[PDB]
């Protein structure tokens, strides 16, 4: 409990520190954006006298709350997001715990099924993600066996061989699972280099805010399944990298505790 | 460690589970979605009838403009900042816990860069805390189980845990947020499993004046509830390994 309460203080400090950085980075721009939206609404009310401010506000709120409740207030649709295609990809967000929220159960029966789907689906997916990580580790172990043979003849210390290997695993993994897919996302979704990198990190870390979702704007036939294949291998890579950071914090804490 | 033959077999199982799940989700949601998409069109048509000075393309531009502004971080309602220290502290929590509701998300270029670095070191930092909380909860349960003294103990851990971490908080959420019994249970599961869709977020309605102790008590429940759900999901994962080993022999 002494270590637990010490780690809890560290996390609270980290949360207050992060909360201050986020406020300073976002609040001035948010106040600027909230002024221009008010100006646009005021100019709309001037251009449409037959619409009162409370009627406009009711309409805007009604559209936002309907969109949040599962029904899109755009178009007529005689574009369903509950067809087998989008339903298969929604089921993926549940078992991967990414949960963007762009598609979510609105029916009472759908909410009951989603509870049971995560209960058995999340541990079922965890077994697959462990196997994908072992397959990626075996593929990296086969590639590293040729690199370590060159370093062995160059008299590099056995402990440093593992140090160079961990940096290579992180660098090569960041290329095929982070940069290469984000370049594709920039050229397809029309997102900036930063927004594409931000999407990759948020997706593969299972945070899934839902502000950026691949294949959402009203795409190629091969696009959606290739994105979800990248999710499967990318989650296993990010799990290994986040485990290395978690292990480095334990080694850093043990060295600091002794000194 | 795991052979490719077992990995490819487990991959087929997951694809079957995803296609099966998708079929259940389509049958449960598509008829209601078609019903909801008809009433939204009727509402828009009746609005255009009540406000002749607004053309359908102007109404559609306005609705799209409001949805895209809301999605970009700026709420088109009112004239209530969601980036104040209070809401920003709770947003930072959704990042390290990987829940990520998405109700609040970085809009500035600097905020997106900081959020990438915040998750990279914050997620493993939180994982160390969540492991310690799980050990403290296991030690508290081990002390209570010693007084009662394995099958009965596992059922007792699951049942008592479901009372204090799932039912008791959901009852409070129903009496505070105005959510139904099912919507409150759905919220608890989605939150404590780090899925975090964002459709239901505690302390989100502007109209209701929430208590001072409400928001931090929800985030304290998240801390202990995540550690409990990790233990339960690990038991289900272990159950599947024991079930697969028994079926492999037979």
């Amino acid at each position, epitope marked *: 409990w002494k270590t637990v309460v010490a780690i809890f203080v560290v996390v609270v400090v980290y949360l207050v520190t992060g909360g201050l950085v986020f406020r300073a980075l976002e609040q001035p721009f948010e106040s600027s954006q909230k002024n221009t939206i008010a100006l646009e*609404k005021a100019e709309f009310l001037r251009d449409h006298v037959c619409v009162s401010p409370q009627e406009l506000e009711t309409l805007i709120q009604h559209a936002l709350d309907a969109d949040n409740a599962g029904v899109s207030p755009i178009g007529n649709s005689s574009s369903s997001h509950w067809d087998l295609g989008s339903a298969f990809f929604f089921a993926g967000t549940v078992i991967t715990t990414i949960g963007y929220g762009n598609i979510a159960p609105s029916t009472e029966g759908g909410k009951i099924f989603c509870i049971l789907y995560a209960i058995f689906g999340i541990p079922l997916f965890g077994f697959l993600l462990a196997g994908i990580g072992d397959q990626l580790g075996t593929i990296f172990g086969k590639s590293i066996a040729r690199v370590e043979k060159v370093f062995r003849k160059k008299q590099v210390s056995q402990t440093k061989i593992r140090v160079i290997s961990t940096i290579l695993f992180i660098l090569a993994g960041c290329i095929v699972f982070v940069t290469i897919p984000a370049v594709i996302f920039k050229y397809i979704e029309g997102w900036t280099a930063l927004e594409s990198i931000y999407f990759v990190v948020v997706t593969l870390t299972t945070v899934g805010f839902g502000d950026f979702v691949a294949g959402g704007n009203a795409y190629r036939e091969w696009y959606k399944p290739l994105v979800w294949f990248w999710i499967l291998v990318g989650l296993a890579y990010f799990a290994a990298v986040l485990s290395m950071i978690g292990d480095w914090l334990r080694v850093l804490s043990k060295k600091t505790k002794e000194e | 460690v795991m052979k490719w033959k077992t990995v490819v077999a487990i991959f087929v199982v997951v694809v079957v589970y995803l296609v099966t799940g998708g079929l259940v989700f389509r049958a449960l949601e598509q008829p209601f979605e078609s019903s909801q998409k008809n009433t939204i069109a009727l509402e828009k048509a009746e609005f255009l009838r009540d406000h002749v000075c607004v053309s359908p*393309q102007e109404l559609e*531009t306005l609705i799209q403009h409001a949805l895209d502004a809301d999605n970009a971080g700026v709420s088109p309602i009112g004239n209530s900042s969601h980036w104040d220290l209070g809401s920003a502290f709770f947003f930072a929590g959704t990042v390290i816990t990987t829940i990520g509701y998405g109700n609040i998300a970085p809009s500035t270029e600097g905020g997106k860069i900081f959020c990438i670095l915040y998750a990279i070191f914050g997620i493993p930092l939180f994982g160390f805390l969540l492991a310690g909380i799980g050990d403290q909860l296991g030690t508290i349960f081990g002390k209570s189980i010693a007084r009662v003294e394995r099958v009965i103990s596992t059922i007792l851990f699951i049942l008592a845990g479901c009372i204090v971490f799932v039912t008791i908080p959901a009852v409070i959420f129903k009496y505070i947020e105005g959510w139904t019994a099912l919507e409150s249970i759905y919220f608890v599961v989605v939150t404590l499993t780090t899925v975090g869709f964002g459709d239901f977020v505690a302390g989100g309605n502007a109209g209701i004046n929430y208590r001072e102790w409400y928001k931090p008590l929800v985030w304290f429940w998240i801390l202990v509830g995540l550690a409990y759900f990790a233990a339960v999901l690990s038991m289900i994962g272990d159950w599947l390994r024991v079930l697969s080993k028994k079926t492999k022999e037979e």
Partner: nanobody
Amino acid sequence: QVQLVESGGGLVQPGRSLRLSCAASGYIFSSATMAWYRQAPGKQRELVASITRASNTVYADSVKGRFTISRDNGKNTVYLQMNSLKPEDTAVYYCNVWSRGYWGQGTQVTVS
């Protein structure tokens, strides 16, 4: 000073395509919603098309499937690709910053 410069209008044949452009300046173009309007001689101002900050497009029912609005944030220019022009499209086209009161000069497009 918000300035909207229009181009690409003029006399055209019915059925033939035409492209209007709008060089914008004096404001943050990336986050603003652009729109195109048309003033018919015997009619009032009519919204033709509108592209939001997230590149989502909204069109008038009369121009649906024929006209296409697109934005080039890199060059701060909003376009209106008018295809399969009918004599009913003969009107003065104005470039607008939707719900901000900023209008262009107006380019006469005549289809006959």
